[PDB]
Amino acid sequence: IIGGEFTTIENQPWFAAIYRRHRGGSVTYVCGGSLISPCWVISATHCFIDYPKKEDYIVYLGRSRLNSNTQGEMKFEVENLILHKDYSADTLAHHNDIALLKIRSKEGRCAQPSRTIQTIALPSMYNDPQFGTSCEITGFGKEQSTDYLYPEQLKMTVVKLISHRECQQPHYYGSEVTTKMLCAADPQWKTDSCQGDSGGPLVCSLQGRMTLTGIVSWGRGCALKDKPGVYTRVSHFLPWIRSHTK
């Protein structure tokens, strides 16, 4: 996360840390996620598109640190790695950029809620907040685009939603933002998600309840005028979510 504060997993207990096993024993971080139900993490498909083998991946819940162990964390195998079928990526945009990982401990158990692990609510069909509403992004993505390292500590920040009418100005991203996407950024252009925050939750207050309003998807750069963060619009994918978690 560019700008914003350091948080811990207790402020974003639904957050999920997805890593990939590499063949010389090494294990790097891949992307973030959100736990939408006990057995189900929801992330973004581009995180997995080059390496689509579920057996490569590990999910951690209740994890505030990127490469050291948080007291509370549970480690998971990926039983199912569902990527969206009609996913496609162009110069910038990524479309239908939404993944689902069913999780299971080597012991068989799913996510058991705790001080540091909780589920997050999905919105109603086509039920987002209005433009200009403040929302929370979270992850281990870079503190500045140009770095070559991720933060060891989990970060969060706040951003305002940007109407599609405003997002689609050629000034911004123009054509490339569909109605299945969602634009959020800071007024001042100084805080945003960045690389490696992908798959992570854009969370807005909806019906007096924290709701997964987006998945971190793409942007040009990290936090630069006048290019907002773009997020997969969760409300428009509930049939796909409900059908594949069925």
Ligand SMILES: O=c1c(O)c(-c2ccc(O)c(O)c2)oc2cc(O)cc(O)c12
């Ligand atoms: O898929 C990707 C993605 O979405 C982002 C990104 C860009 C701008 C943002 O504002 C943002 O939040 C994320 O960077 C990437 C960098 C890569 O090397 C590969 C990718 O696949 C992505």
